[PDB]
């Protein structure tokens, strides 16, 4: 599909089971999830942005779907206001930026 | 141009007359960048990010060049990690997002 970013581009995901509503968002190195209790291995991580740094759990080899499109890689869980989808799964989904 | 995600979406932008680089980020609202002086009247804002929120100056009705195409709106600045082109001028140059 195409989106358009007039309004915040939000999308539905699948992951670890469940439906929710993440960001896709170009300037984010990576996945970042509002906190849920996966399961699996982690460990931790520091990752950061405007405002500085959080602490998150970081989950390997985790299937996505974002918009029916099949994804598999690393998710950052912690205290992140929004879901977020990141460039490692954005561009396992072929997405661009196109102007 | 159409922009794959393998690498972080930087480009280069004129404002104020000096060249800069920036992130386009569609997880962004708002245009935000580094520590800079600008033309003109500007006001104190707050905007929040990952790790928190953060005083920004916000300078109203700039022009940006981004890759050659041209836009002009509102533009903050302040203690961001990386300068960063956010939807309200994203949505300008008629970017999308497409998979």
Redesign the interface.
Same mark, same amino acid.
């Given at each position: @599909?195409?989106?358009? $970013?007039?309004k915040? @581009?939000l999308v539905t995901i699948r992951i670890g089971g469940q439906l929710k509503e993440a $960001?896709?968002?170009?300037?984010?190195?990576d996945t970042?999830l509002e906190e849920m209790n996966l399961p699996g291995k982690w460990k931790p991580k520091m990752?950061?942005? *405007?405002?500085?740094? *959080?602490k998150v759990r970081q989950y390997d080899q985790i299937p996505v779907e974002i !918009?029916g499109?099949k994804a598999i890689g690393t998710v950052l869980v912690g205290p992140? @206001?929004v879901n *977020?989808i990141g460039?490692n799964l $954005?561009?396992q989904?072929? !997405?661009? $930026?196109?102007?």
């Open positions: @599909p195409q989106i358009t $970013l007039w915040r @581009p $960001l896709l968002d170009t300037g984010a190195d970042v990752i950061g942005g *405007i405002g500085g740094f *959080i !918009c499109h992140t @206001p *977020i460039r $954005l561009t989904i072929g !997405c661009t $930026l196109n102007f």
